[PDB]
Design a binder for these strands. Structure first.
Ligand SMILES: [Mg+2]
Ligand SMILES: [Mg+2]
Ligand SMILES: [Mg+2]
Ligand SMILES: [Mg+2]
Ligand SMILES: [Mg+2]
Ligand SMILES: [Mg+2]
Ligand SMILES: [Mg+2]
Ligand SMILES: [Mg+2]
Ligand SMILES: [Mg+2]
Ligand SMILES: [Mg+2]
Ligand SMILES: [Mg+2]
Ligand SMILES: [Mg+2]
Ligand SMILES: [Mg+2]
Lengths: 179, 141, 125, 55
RNA sequence: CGUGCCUACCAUGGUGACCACGGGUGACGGGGAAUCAGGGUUCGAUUCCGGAGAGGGAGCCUGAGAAACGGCUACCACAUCCAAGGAAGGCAGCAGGCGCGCAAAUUACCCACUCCCGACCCGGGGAGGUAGUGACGAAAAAUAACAAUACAGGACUCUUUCGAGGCCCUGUAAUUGGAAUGAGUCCACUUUAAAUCCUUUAACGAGGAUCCAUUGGAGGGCAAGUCUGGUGCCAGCAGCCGCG
């Protein structure tokens, strides 16, 4: 029969209690602080952090001199450093569990724009990274949920666009009105 | 109390397999009388035919005349008194209409206000009661 | 204006052909069509343009690069021999003239029902 | 014996009210931005005993 | 071919409370799937492997391989033509039609990719791939957004300030631009067997008549009104407690 692809992954934390007052206040102040749309993209970050914590507890269960533990722990530390959550300091597995929620939202696309300029009100920075106006490199970035890696971390330019590139997208309307 | 030896697992599974039938949910899930005695033939929804419209009474603390429809089924062929949900809808559920029915909140028990009605009307002639109550154009008359 | 660079490059001397992966750069206007990339590759190879084929063009979401597969051939007879009719159809060498469903199958049915002279009359006419 | 004539009595006797022209609402992220600007650390003058989200 | 597979004789054996034997399964078996301590519980017809059948069920030619059914023979239940002495059939294949049911897609195109068959580079394949319906479901994700201008609700660094607002959000059917950009409208690209969709790009393309976001609720659980008008244990609401 057919053979193309069959897979299903749900990057989605579903809470047990639906209506917790402190948890709704925490998630909405998280959204209003870090510039998000809905709570499913909070639950994205919560699911990634939960999966990393599951892998970290599975590694900390094993013996210290285990080669599988050494390989998977060095790989997890390398991936978290290349994301940029960790530093070049504490390379222990307990500090991975010591990580918090807001670090991944800090390493996402909009907060790096906040830390390295051309932000101008994060709610407008969402529009600036949605519309083609903020471009990590020659492969054009469109989607706001973009984990900015530490390996480049600074290439925020844009070419052939409205404010510095050029062209008359809708100022030709005003020019034809004045002419 | 229990039996905690290394070769007692047959006695354990025999005891659990015997004492598991005394739960209500296990025996109603794995006994055939909840297929050969219930309506729907073990289904979730079912179409039916309006037979008559019956005004039943409420319970003892409440005081209301609930409006229900005795429904002649299509799949099994039994008779089900199904409830008319909303404020109106008695004038929207007429005689000989294609009527889809479901549960209230539980197949076993009923609602604590209506004595002997286990099921609830959703559709009238492929048009829902929400549509007949608000929004949509007009009945399929 | 445009810049065409070949990244991967192989030479099949058995069939007298050369395979390559072509990246066309776009800091400017739209995707350059089938003819002009072929003509620029013919200018960079400095032979007759009527022998080089190319197929496939992606686009990396705003300017950037477009990636395809190019085939430089050294003989037009080898190009007519080793290539399928659908890639000859870009230049119009092969013509089938009956690209229709159920025609061949109804001819099979008319050749399956009757047999012999009536079959040569009906199924072939 | 229970009569079926009183069907939709309150739905019939309810006086109809024309829905007045309310302006358009905000989007998903804009509504969350309005919630964060309204019901959080932006404006909180009073003491943390009573709550006033609707009155 | 090794066999109680079958036959003639001889012996009376073999299984079972460590559940055989006899029934039911809404029972094809697995690799797997759902469920978040561990342990478990429930499905697995479904794309892979192996088995079984081509309406029920028996027999057989050919063939290395069949008890084959897009092979045949006879019976039963269906069922087409009939000029009434006879012919002809098996969609649990692909589309589609009837019935059934809560319930499930178009009489589309191509061997272009992967394989397969045949004498064979060349033909064929509803195997497959592409296209249409599709809110089973999974991922990313506009719906009016944004920076400023001005009144004030002012929480607030600060001096008797009834303000210096080089921190600020909000009601502004208030102005202002970037006239941002997207969906759509379409040329030329490109993908592609021919096309469509994805992306590139030329030109139109927002100011509350916009290009309108709905689904449920506001006594507790369970986030949110002791607001207004009718109904007056009637209608009804409420999955339980309860209200009228
Ligand atoms: Mg109940
Ligand atoms: Mg079965
Ligand atoms: Mg689990
Ligand atoms: Mg488990
Ligand atoms: Mg076997
Ligand atoms: Mg068979
Ligand atoms: Mg059949
Ligand atoms: Mg077959
Ligand atoms: Mg068949
Ligand atoms: Mg109300
Ligand atoms: Mg509450
Ligand atoms: Mg209500
Ligand atoms: Mg409810």
């Amino acid at each position: 029969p057919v053979a193309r692809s069959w897979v299903c992954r749900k990057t989605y934390v579903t809470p047990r209690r639906p209506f917790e007052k402190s948890r709704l206040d925490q998630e909405l102040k998280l959204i209003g602080e870090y510039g998000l749309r809905n709570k499913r993209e909070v639950w994205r970050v919560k699911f990634t952090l939960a999966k990393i914590r599951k892998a970290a507890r599975e590694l900390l269960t094993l013996d210290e001199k285990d080669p599988r533990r050494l390989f998977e722990g060095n790989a997890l530390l390398r991936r978290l450093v290349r994301i940029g959550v960790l530093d070049e300091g504490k390379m222990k597995l307990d500090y991975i569990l010591g990580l918090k929620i807001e670090d991944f939202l800090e390493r996402r696309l909009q907060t790096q724009v906040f830390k390295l300029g051309l932000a101008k009100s994060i709610h407008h920075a969402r529009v600036l990274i949605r519309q083609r106006h903020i471009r990590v490199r020659k492969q054009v970035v469109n989607i706001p949920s973009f984990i900015v890696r530490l390996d480049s971390q600074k290439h925020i330019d844009f070419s052939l666009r409205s404010p510095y590139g050029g062209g008359r997208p809708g100022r030709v309307k005003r020019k034809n009105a004045k002419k | 109390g229990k039996c905690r030896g290394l070769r007692t697992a047959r006695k354990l599974r025999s005891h659990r397999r015997d004492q598991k039938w005394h739960d209500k949910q296990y025996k109603k899930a794995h006994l055939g009388t909840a297929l050969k005695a219930n309506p729907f033939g073990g289904a979730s929804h079912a179409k039916g035919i309006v037979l008559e419209k019956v005004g039943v009474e409420a319970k003892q603390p409440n005081s209301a005349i609930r409006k229900c429809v005795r429904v002649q089924l299509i799949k099994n062929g039994k008779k089900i008194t199904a409830f008319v949900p909303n404020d109106g809808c008695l004038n929207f559920i007429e005689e000989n209409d294609e009527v889809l029915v479901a549960g209230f909140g539980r197949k076993g028990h009923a609602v604590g206000d209506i004595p002997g009605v286990r099921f609830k009307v959703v559709k009238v002639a492929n048009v829902s009661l929400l549509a007949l109550y608000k929004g949509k154009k007009e009945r399929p008359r | 204006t445009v810049t065409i660079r070949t990244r991967k490059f192989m030479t099949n001397r058995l069939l007298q052909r050369k395979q390559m992966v072509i990246d066309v750069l776009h800091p400017g206007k739209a995707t350059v069509p089938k003819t002009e990339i072929r003509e620029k590759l013919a200018k960079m190879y400095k032979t007759t343009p009527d022998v080089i084929f190319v197929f496939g063009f992606r686009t990396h979401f705003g300017g950037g690069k477009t990636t395809g597969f190019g085939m430089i051939y050294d003989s037009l007879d080898y190009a007519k021999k080793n290539e399928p009719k659908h890639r000859l159809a870009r230049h119009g060498l092969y013509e089938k003239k009956k690209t229709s469903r159920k025609q061949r199958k109804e001819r099979k049915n008319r050749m399956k029902k009757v047999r012999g002279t009536a079959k040569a009359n009906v199924g072939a006419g | 014996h229970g009569s079926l004539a009183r069907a939709g009595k309150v739905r019939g006797q309810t006086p109809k009210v024309a829905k007045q022209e309310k302006k358009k609402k905000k989007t998903g992220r804009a509504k969350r931005r309005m919630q964060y600007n309204r019901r959080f650390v932006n404006v909180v003058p009073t003491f943390g005993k009573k709550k006033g989200p609707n009155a």
